[PDB]
Structure formats: structure tokens, C-alpha cells
Write an enzyme that holds these catalytic residues in place. Structure first.
Site, PDB file in Angstrom:
ATOM      1  N   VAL A  39       0.940  -1.060  -0.363  1.00 56.77           N
ATOM      2  CA  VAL A  39      -0.047   0.045   0.098  1.00 56.77           C
ATOM      3  C   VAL A  39       0.936   1.389   0.297  1.00 56.77           C
ATOM      4  O   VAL A  39       0.307   2.186   0.130  1.00 56.77           O
ATOM      5  CB  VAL A  39      -0.937   0.168   1.623  1.00 56.77           C
ATOM      6  CG1 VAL A  39      -1.679  -0.851   1.517  1.00 56.77           C
ATOM      7  CG2 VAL A  39       0.022   0.112   2.238  1.00 56.77           C
ATOM      8  N   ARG A  41       5.330   3.000   0.031  1.00 52.82           N
ATOM      9  CA  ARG A  41       6.620   2.885  -0.718  1.00 52.82           C
ATOM     10  C   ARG A  41       7.337   4.184  -1.080  1.00 52.82           C
ATOM     11  O   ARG A  41       7.325   4.595  -1.006  1.00 52.82           O
ATOM     12  CB  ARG A  41       7.338   1.791  -1.386  1.00 52.82           C
ATOM     13  CG  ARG A  41       6.651   2.243  -2.985  1.00 52.82           C
ATOM     14  CD  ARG A  41       7.272   1.173  -4.448  1.00 52.82           C
ATOM     15  NE  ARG A  41       8.450   1.665  -4.153  1.00 52.82           N
ATOM     16  CZ  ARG A  41       8.864   0.161  -4.205  1.00 52.82           C
ATOM     17  NH1 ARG A  41       8.248  -1.291  -3.965  1.00 52.82           N
ATOM     18  NH2 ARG A  41       9.830   0.108  -3.732  1.00 52.82           N
ATOM     19  N   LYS A  43      11.435   5.248   0.167  1.00 55.14           N
ATOM     20  CA  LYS A  43      13.129   4.709  -0.999  1.00 55.14           C
ATOM     21  C   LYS A  43      14.016   4.184   1.288  1.00 55.14           C
ATOM     22  O   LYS A  43      15.234   3.376   0.593  1.00 55.14           O
ATOM     23  CB  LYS A  43      13.348   5.965  -1.152  1.00 55.14           C
ATOM     24  CG  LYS A  43      14.718   7.238  -0.474  1.00 55.14           C
ATOM     25  CD  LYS A  43      16.022   7.460  -0.979  1.00 55.14           C
ATOM     26  CE  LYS A  43      15.639   9.173  -0.837  1.00 55.14           C
ATOM     27  NZ  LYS A  43      14.594   9.541  -1.623  1.00 55.14           N
ATOM     28  N   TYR A  44      13.448   3.492   1.760  1.00 55.15           N
ATOM     29  CA  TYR A  44      13.667   3.872   3.141  1.00 55.15           C
ATOM     30  C   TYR A  44      12.775   2.629   3.656  1.00 55.15           C
ATOM     31  O   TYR A  44      12.580   2.327   4.257  1.00 55.15           O
ATOM     32  CB  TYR A  44      13.959   5.176   3.568  1.00 55.15           C
ATOM     33  CG  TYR A  44      14.629   6.362   3.763  1.00 55.15           C
ATOM     34  CD1 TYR A  44      16.469   6.004   3.680  1.00 55.15           C
ATOM     35  CD2 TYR A  44      14.272   7.913   3.245  1.00 55.15           C
ATOM     36  CE1 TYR A  44      17.018   6.615   2.852  1.00 55.15           C
ATOM     37  CE2 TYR A  44      14.857   8.457   3.426  1.00 55.15           C
ATOM     38  CZ  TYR A  44      16.275   8.106   3.419  1.00 55.15           C
ATOM     39  OH  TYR A  44      17.232   9.072   3.304  1.00 55.15           O
ATOM     40  N   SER A  45      11.728   2.278   2.390  1.00 54.24           N
ATOM     41  CA  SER A  45      11.313   1.504   3.203  1.00 54.24           C
ATOM     42  C   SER A  45      10.609   0.718   2.331  1.00 54.24           C
ATOM     43  O   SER A  45       9.357   1.717   1.043  1.00 54.24           O
ATOM     44  CB  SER A  45      10.653   1.621   4.080  1.00 54.24           C
ATOM     45  OG  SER A  45       9.629   2.358   4.129  1.00 54.24           O
ATOM     46  N   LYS A  62       5.916  -2.206   7.738  1.00 47.03           N
ATOM     47  CA  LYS A  62       6.843  -1.271   7.174  1.00 47.03           C
ATOM     48  C   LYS A  62       7.984  -2.352   7.193  1.00 47.03           C
ATOM     49  O   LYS A  62       8.890  -2.502   7.962  1.00 47.03           O
ATOM     50  CB  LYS A  62       7.087   0.490   8.029  1.00 47.03           C
ATOM     51  CG  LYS A  62       8.196   0.708   7.374  1.00 47.03           C
ATOM     52  CD  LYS A  62       7.890   2.153   8.398  1.00 47.03           C
ATOM     53  CE  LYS A  62       9.030   3.531   7.738  1.00 47.03           C
ATOM     54  NZ  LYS A  62       8.726   4.491   8.349  1.00 47.03           N
ATOM     55  N   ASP A 150      10.000  16.455   9.070  1.00 50.09           N
ATOM     56  CA  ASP A 150       9.754  15.447   8.144  1.00 50.09           C
ATOM     57  C   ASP A 150       7.962  15.505   7.651  1.00 50.09           C
ATOM     58  O   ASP A 150       6.884  14.424   7.331  1.00 50.09           O
ATOM     59  CB  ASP A 150      10.144  14.101   8.087  1.00 50.09           C
ATOM     60  CG  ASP A 150       9.871  13.791   5.799  1.00 50.09           C
ATOM     61  OD1 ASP A 150       9.386  14.231   4.986  1.00 50.09           O
ATOM     62  OD2 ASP A 150       9.677  12.538   6.312  1.00 50.09           O
TER      63      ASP A 150
HETATM   64  C1  LIG Z   1       2.483   5.674   1.587  1.00 55.95           C
HETATM   65  S1  LIG Z   1       1.056   4.709   1.955  1.00 55.95           S
HETATM   66  C2  LIG Z   1       1.433   4.231   3.776  1.00 55.95           C
HETATM   67  N1  LIG Z   1       0.064   4.420   4.078  1.00 55.95           N
HETATM   68  C3  LIG Z   1       0.502   3.988   5.314  1.00 55.95           C
HETATM   69  C4  LIG Z   1      -0.589   3.547   6.912  1.00 55.95           C
HETATM   70 BR1  LIG Z   1      -2.350   3.773   6.581  1.00 55.95          BR
HETATM   71  C5  LIG Z   1       0.788   3.474   8.192  1.00 55.95           C
HETATM   72 BR2  LIG Z   1      -0.595   3.066   9.714  1.00 55.95          BR
HETATM   73  C6  LIG Z   1       1.736   3.763   8.147  1.00 55.95           C
HETATM   74 BR3  LIG Z   1       2.888   4.026   9.830  1.00 55.95          BR
HETATM   75  C7  LIG Z   1       2.307   4.419   7.036  1.00 55.95           C
HETATM   76 BR4  LIG Z   1       4.525   4.442   7.031  1.00 55.95          BR
HETATM   77  C8  LIG Z   1       1.749   4.083   6.044  1.00 55.95           C
HETATM   78  N2  LIG Z   1       2.593   4.508   4.560  1.00 55.95           N
END
Ligand SMILES: CSc1nc2c(Br)c(Br)c(Br)c(Br)c2[nH]1
Ligand SMILES: CSc1nc2c(Br)c(Br)c(Br)c(Br)c2[nH]1
EC number: 2.7.11.1
Lengths: 325, 325
Positions: A39, A41, A43-45, A62, A150
Site C-alpha cells: 500500500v 513505499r 526509498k527507505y522502506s 513497514k 518530515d
Molecule cells: C504511503 S502509503 C502508507 N500508508 C501507511 C499507513 Br496506513 C501507516 Br499506519 C503507516 Br505507519 C505508513 Br509508513 C503508511 N504508508
């Protein structure tokens, strides 16, 4: 420079609070969590919705791309100090791939709606509300001695239906230490505060308010990013072209900071641009005297002049939202 | 003009909340309270420490000099709506001289120390603390739809030992009604906001913040009154000589308010006077960048620019006091 607020949080707290390098991770079971679908991404995960095999509750997995053990301890320790605080993404577990050490942070699940599609649907009040919610996250982490560094839509997960918001991705976050110089290669470019663009390394919580201010200008003026600079230098140019350079000058002089000849002539000389000059039929209904007044108090070259998170929450702009509370 | 906050408090509340003329006083026993010693006196009342004959608890007996039944209902109704709120003088009973109708309001007792002798003893933090406490009173009454209209040291009872403060004398207080013109002969002269000096009758809660600002300038700069004007006209002159007249001009133009030719030439033209120019060896230790910044945000010609009570409480100046909380 020193933060005008929460400056002594860490100095009065036990060293094990901020000494993140001295953290000994308690790894859980890389099994309890199953990836269901990517869902997101950075560049660090890579990020995937996931299931907690045990209770079947949704979760967010993550998976971190090769990170220096020192940085992971930072993100982890910060997540741990802020876990429980208002609208701070809850970290539920840290695990690792047995075979290769690859770390995965397990967080609470948020049925998020990407901002690129959520924001245009947001009403005046919705924006006020959500920004407000984000301010609780911010005032809270700041009150714990932590700079997110950030802030941006991408890092603000939002479940519109539940109206639940969480400030996420504390990978660029750092503990605040009175009079400490920090790397200015933090936060995304479009949200980089002027201090980051002029190498003013002794910044603080205020860095975030500028970020917020950028995010806010984007939401009310429907112009994402608000300051679209192709590169760090051009980022300071998109700003000067809005806030005006004389303001910049005062900023630079107050903190005895020079500018590199190259960028210096690139930022040239620009007059301040009234915020209302960003108004148009598309955002007219989101712009208002209070929105402008609130934003104006966010986007200040001088990090010291910017509203602190706690002050922003009491700005009349948020009056209706506070009243619902 | 309309208050930027708490503007609809009264419009959403039952009419019996603000309709003070429709109050039917519940007189108590003029006996339960015995005058022990005159401890004060305004031109609208004589004040005496008193004893509650029943429980022997001290109390404050405020005997009102012939007041129009309509004004008493105002002060009384206001005292009743705010009774219980933070640092609002508690009204314990209303009584009357059987023989002649003379009203006496019975209040909680406050072992007050007159400001003329208390303030010079106040430490930096003490001032911050007490001003803070006064801000809770103010933000509270404002949040109930009430303008005190008479903020000043004389109306801020303080028990230094207990650090208990109460905002007193709600005789000049009024309910706020969006877009209503009020008498500008309220509050003491030295605390009269510019709007009162230029007959801007549609004022609001902000009037009080200016008063507070005056009181604050007096306490940090050790100059009581801060704006010593012999008469209403001269009061606007002591101000212009500090805030500068160009600021005044902008104020006057924004609200399309003219000035009477006479006073107009009396206020002449003055440049803004830096707040730090009021600093001297005697008050140097009470003045600070934050004190100045807070004060600057209080003393604004434009009542709309002034910090609201809720915003003032979150100004970094009060950070240490909030931390103790
Ligand atoms: C760019 S999409 C995405 N959706 C996220 C959600 Br829901 C969570 Br909770 C977290 Br922690 C992160 Br990291 C996420 N990155
Ligand atoms: C000017 S001397 C004085 N002390 C007062 C106290 Br203690 C209270 Br409580 C009230 Br109510 C009033 Br009115 C007061 N006036």
C-alpha cells in the site's frame, strides 16, 4: 538559536530517554504478521497492509530497506517515546527476517485515503479539523523533545470516514537538544524550512511548523506542492518569490548567516506576495481571513517567529473545531 | 466588527442566560454578614471585610451606592453565570438593607495585598504566573460571552501567600452580542482601549486584552499607570506617543472611524516607540524578549490583531508557568 518552548525536555529527562544508540531492540515474531498488499513505499522502506495472524486485526507492516542499526534505533526509540500520544502512529511491534536481518516495524492500521485524492474532497471545516488533529501530534512530540523533521501529506495518514489522523514516518525524526546543529538534509524538499535551505543548523520544533505551513498553504490554496522547487536551491527561490527577499534578508542578518554567491544571485530580489494573490475560484471557499492569518503566522522565515504548535491550536481559525471539542 | 472568538455564545444560549433585566433577585439575610473593617471603596460601592455570622468564615461585603436596579441585575447575572469559573470572584449571596433597599453583594474572601505594594515585590515568574491566572479568568468569562470591560490591578485581587487570584468587580461587565454598539465610557481611563478612545462602539472581548496589556506593561516596566492620561483625549495621546500614530492611522482607516479635529491635532504625529525603550535598571530583570513579544501582541490598536485570552496563555512567555501545571 534555541527553541522558544520545550527546550529543556531532554536535559531534564533520564539519558535513556534520548540516548537511542543505547537501545536494545526487543524483536518479536516475524510470523505474527502477514503481508496482504503493498500500500506504499518510500526509498527507505516498502509498506504493506498486513494481518496480525493472532487476532486477525489489520496492521501496517513497514519493511525497512537496509538501514544503519543506529538510525533504526532512532526511529524506534522515538516511536516508543511517543506511543500513546495524540495522533501519533502507534508502533505495535518490531520484528526481523530471521534469514537476513531485514527489519519490519509493525504499526496500527489506518484505512488511509491518499491525500492526492482526499484533500480535494475536504471541506473548509474538514481542513481545519485535520490540520488541528495534526497539531496535536506535533505539539505532543514537540512536548516530548522530538522534532519530526518530515511533516507532509504523505506522512499524515487519514481515515476520512473515522476522521482519525496519525502523523507517520518518524524516520527523519530527532531529539531536540538546546544548541545542537542538525543535518539540513531532512524532510522532503517541498516542505524544507528556510533554515534548511540556508544551512541554519541549530533549528528546532519550529522546523515542523513551516512544513505544516507548506502543507496548509497547499490544502487551502489547492496548490500541491505550494513551493514546488526542483532542487534545494530552487526551493529557496520559490519561497523568496512568495515571502519576499527583504524578509529573507532580515532573517539572514539576525542569524548572521551568509548565502552562497550562486544561490544568492539566483534568489535575486522579490517583493512579498500577498497570500490572497494565491486565491482563485477553485480555493476561494477555503481561503478566509483567519486561514490567511493562521498561514501567515506559520510561513515565517524566522523559525523563532513561527507559531508554536500549542499556539496554532488556539488561533481563532480553529475556534469552531475546538468548540466541537 | 465582531469578536474573532466566542462570538455566538449568547446567540446559542437560552435568552434567560443573557437577558439580565429579566432577573428576579433572590435576596438573602442582610444579617448573616457582619462588617468587620472597610478594606476598599469605589465610587459605586464601599467594600468591607466581613464575617459570615453563621459559619464564621470571612467574606467580602460590597455595599452598593444607589444603583439603578437594571445595572445591579447586570452585575448580578454576570456574577451568577461566571460563578465557579477559573479565578472568577465567587458571589456567595445578595442581600439588602431592610429599611432602605441598599444592596450588598457578599463574595468569597480574598486576603488581598494591594497591588501598589504587591507588584514591586513580584518576581519575573510571579508576574508571569499571576498574569497567567488572570488570563484564565478572562478566557473563561469571554468563553461565556462576557466582556469584563474593567480590567486593571484594582480589579485583580491577589493573595500572594496562597497564590490565589480572582478577577473582581463585574459592575462594568457586559454580555457580548455580535455587532452591538456599547458605551465607550467603561473601564478605568488608564486601561481604556484605543477603540474606547475613538468611539469604536462595536468592540468585544479584545477590549480586555488591551486592558491586560496595559496592566502588563505596568508590571514589567514598573510604570503604573503605563499610559497615564489625565483625560480620555490625553489617554489616546499617551498611547500614540508609544505605539506611533501611523499605526493609529491604519486602525482608523480600517474601521472607517474619524477623529474629532480637536483631539486629532492633539495626538499629532508620533513614531512608534520600541518597547525596550521603556527598560531601565529597575525593570530590566522583568523585561525579556518573550515579555516584550507577549506585550507587543496585547497592545495593538486593532482589537482584531490582539491576542485572544486563549492565545495569550499559550505564548512561550507563559511556558514555565504552564510547565508547573
Ligand atoms: C504511503 S502509503 C502508507 N500508508 C501507511 C499507513 Br496506513 C501507516 Br499506519 C503507516 Br505507519 C505508513 Br509508513 C503508511 N504508508
Ligand atoms: C479595593 S479593596 C477590595 N478588596 C476586595 C476583595 Br478581597 C474582594 Br473578594 C472584592 Br469582591 C472586592 Br470588590 C474588593 N475590593
Amino acid at each position: 538559536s534555541k527553541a522558544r518552548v520545550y527546550a529543556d525536555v531532554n536535559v531534564l529527562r533520564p539519558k535513556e530517554y534520548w540516548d537511542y544508540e543505547a537501545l536494545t531492540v526487543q524483536w518479536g515474531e516475524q510470523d505474527d504478521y502477514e503481508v496482504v498488499r503493498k500500500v506504499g513505499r518510500g526509498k527507505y522502506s516498502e509498506v504493506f497492509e498486513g494481518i496480525n495472524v493472532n487476532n486477525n486485526e489489520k496492521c501496517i507492516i513497514k519493511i525497512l530497506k537496509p538501514v544503519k542499526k543506529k538510525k533504526i534505533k532512532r526511529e524506534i526509540k522515538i516511536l516508543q517515546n511517543l506511543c500513546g500520544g495524540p495522533n501519533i502512529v502507534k508502533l505495535l511491534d518490531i520484528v526481523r527476517d530471521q534469514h537476513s536481518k531485514t527489519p519490519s516495524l509493525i504499526f496500527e492500521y489506518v484505512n488511509n485515503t491518499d491525500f492526492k485524492v482526499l484533500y480535494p474532497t475536504l471541506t473548509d471545516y474538514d481542513i481545519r479539523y485535520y490540520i488541528y488533529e495534526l497539531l496535536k501530534a506535533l505539539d505532543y512530540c514537540h512536548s516530548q523533545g522530538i522534532m519530526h523533521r518530515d511533516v507532509k501529506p504523505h506522512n499524515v495518514m487519514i481515515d476520512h470516514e473515522l476522521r482519525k489522523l496519525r502523523l507517520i514516518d518518524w524516520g527523519l525524526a530527532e531529539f531536540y537538544h538546546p544548541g545542537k546543529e542538525y543535518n539540513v538534509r531532512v524532510a522532503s524538499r517541498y516542505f524544507k524550512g528556510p533554515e534548511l535551505l540556508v544551512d541554519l543548523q541549530d533549528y528546532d520544533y519550529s522546523l515542523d511548523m513551516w512544513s505544516l505551513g507548506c502543507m496548509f498553504a497547499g490544502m487551502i490554496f489547492r496548490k500541491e506542492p505550494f513551493f514546488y522547487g526542483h532542487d534545494n536551491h530552487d526551493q529557496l527561490v520559490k519561497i523568496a518569490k512568495v515571502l519576499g527577499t527583504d524578509g529573507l534578508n532580515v532573517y539572514l542578518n539576525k542569524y548572521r548567516i551568509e548565502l552562497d554567491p550562486q544561490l544568492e544571485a539566483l534568489v535575486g530580489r522579490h517583493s512579498r506576495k500577498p497570500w490572497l494573490k494565491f486565491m482563485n475560484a477553485d480555493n476561494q471557499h477555503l481561503v478566509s481571513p483567519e486561514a490567511i492569518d493562521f498561514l501567515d503566522k506559520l510561513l515565517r522565515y524566522d523559525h523563532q517567529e513561527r507559531l508554536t504548535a500549542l499556539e496554532a491550536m488556539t488561533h481563532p481559525y480553529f475556534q469552531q473545531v475546538r468548540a466541537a471539542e
